[PDB]
Amino acid sequence: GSHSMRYFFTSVSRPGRGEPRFIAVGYVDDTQFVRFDSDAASQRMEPRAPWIEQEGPEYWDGETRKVKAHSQTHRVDLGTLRGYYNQSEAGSHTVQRMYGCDVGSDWRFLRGYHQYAYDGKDYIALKEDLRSWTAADMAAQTTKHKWEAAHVAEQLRAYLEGTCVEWLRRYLENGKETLQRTDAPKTHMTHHAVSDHEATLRCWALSFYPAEITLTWQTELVETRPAGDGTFQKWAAVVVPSGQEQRYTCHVQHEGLPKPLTLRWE
Amino acid sequence: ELAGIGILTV
């Protein structure tokens, strides 16, 4: 029963069209709870979940101040990185940052993350010990030396193993009805002939939370998708010789199920 | 809650 808190930051430069676009979102597990958009009117951290709204103005003042500081550094990043790779001002570019922490089913610290990307490629990343950096190419090395000397890793490590974890626990409690729920998948099966000698069996999993699920035929496999109401969907298909439909069983594994389900054409 | 330290320009 592990949980995570994860922040995503996107900055896209817009050549000759003013400020770069900046997008920040915050997740607890598969559930988004905050966002900031530099193009929006409010110019503040915005709630995206009912349970974060109980937080007072000091919280929002704090988050708006930090998220603005985040966008300032990334604004400068775009200029700097364009230089590191010797690129012209004529094109748009993207920088991305993601970080956060995982806790176990006991809500103790489990793991930590911090990664940076330029134009969708690994740029520099904090290793698993949270004490050193992984730098990809020649350009990232200069950032590595700078951040080593500035003791960035020590600072991020203190946040990830401390503040991140403490607050992740606070969120889990305040939104326990939302975040600590197991909606078991509602299942059903579909049959359609594809030829005179073979047919398609499709196994459906609907309205489940969280996203993690296993669908197994004993295969065409679409990726898990959001329903739009806070739940998820998935299906798996097999092509079966007609008449032999009964030989195949679909198997469903999910946290919300006391015991796994088995479905065959019926 | 966002990080208030360790976020720096590259």
Partner: T-cell receptor
Framework: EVEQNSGPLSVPEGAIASLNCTYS??????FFWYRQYSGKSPELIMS????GDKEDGRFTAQLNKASQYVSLLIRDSQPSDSATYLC???????????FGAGTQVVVTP | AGVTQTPKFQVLKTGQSMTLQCAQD?????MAWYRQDPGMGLRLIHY???????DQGDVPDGYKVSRSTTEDFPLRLLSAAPSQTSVYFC??????????????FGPGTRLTVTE
């Protein structure tokens, strides 16, 4: 508000000097110890961010965010460590540094 | 070379005016002025996050600063009062976005205002 005992602390050479310091803002993220020889300027000797201990040379810093105190240990005390040690606390990188009045240490030969 | 102040000692009579020099050659964006009085520790007077930009500290009354260049950050005493008797420290560091954390202090200016 950053609080320190003025001292002076009298510590024998070779013994371990034990300084501590308390702060009122629970959201504080950055903790520092500055050293100031008499009639001289403060100079940063230690910084700490995580709960627990951090160790750098003869200096050890200890941080407890829950109890809101921060400590400095000086191993192998020398007369040349006789000074005033200032506790410094801020919130976030851009925050304003808050200074304690300092504890004076006298290390006797 | 670090941070220099000028002068290191100064006696003033009430009502007199004086400028305390502070210079730094490390290209630090951030500079600040502190005062130390016996038993209180350091109080921020003014600071500057960059050229042409300055703001008030904990105790700015009676003082004025300017920031025309990166290197210099002078502190002007308008009309010296006995309360202004103290030791004044200049300090600098890179801006926080660049990783500035440690404050680099100058040698200090001991200032006495006599009645």
């Amino acid at each position: 508000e950053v609080e320190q005992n003025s001292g002076p602390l009298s510590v024998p050479e070779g013994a371990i000097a034990s300084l501590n310091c308390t702060y009122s803002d629970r959201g504080s993220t950055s903790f520092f110890w500055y050293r100031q020889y008499s009639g001289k300027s403060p100079e940063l000797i230690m910084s700490i961010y995580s709960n627990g201990d951090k160790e750098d040379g003869r200096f050890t810093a200890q941080l407890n965010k829950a109890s809101q105190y921060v400590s400095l240990l000086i191993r192998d005390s020398q007369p040349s460590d006789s000074a005033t040690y200032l506790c410094a606390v801020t919130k976030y990188s851009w925050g304003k540094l808050q200074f304690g009045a300092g504890t004076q240490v006298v290390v006797t030969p | 070379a670090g941070v220099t102040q000028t002068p290191k000692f100064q006696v003033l009579k009430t009502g007199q005016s004086m400028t305390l020099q502070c210079a730094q050659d490390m290209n630090h964006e951030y500079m600040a002025w502190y005062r130390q009085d016996p038993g209180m520790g350091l109080r921020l007077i003014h600071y500057s996050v960059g050229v042409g930009i300055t703001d008030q500290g904990d105790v700015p009354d009676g003082y004025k600063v300017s920031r025309s260049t990166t290197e210099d950050f002078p502190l002007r005493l308008l009309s010296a009062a006995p309360s202004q008797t103290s030791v004044y420290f200049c300090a600098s560091r890179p801006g926080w976005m660049a990783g500035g954390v440690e404050l680099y202090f100058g040698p200090g200016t001991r200032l006495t205002v006599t009645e």
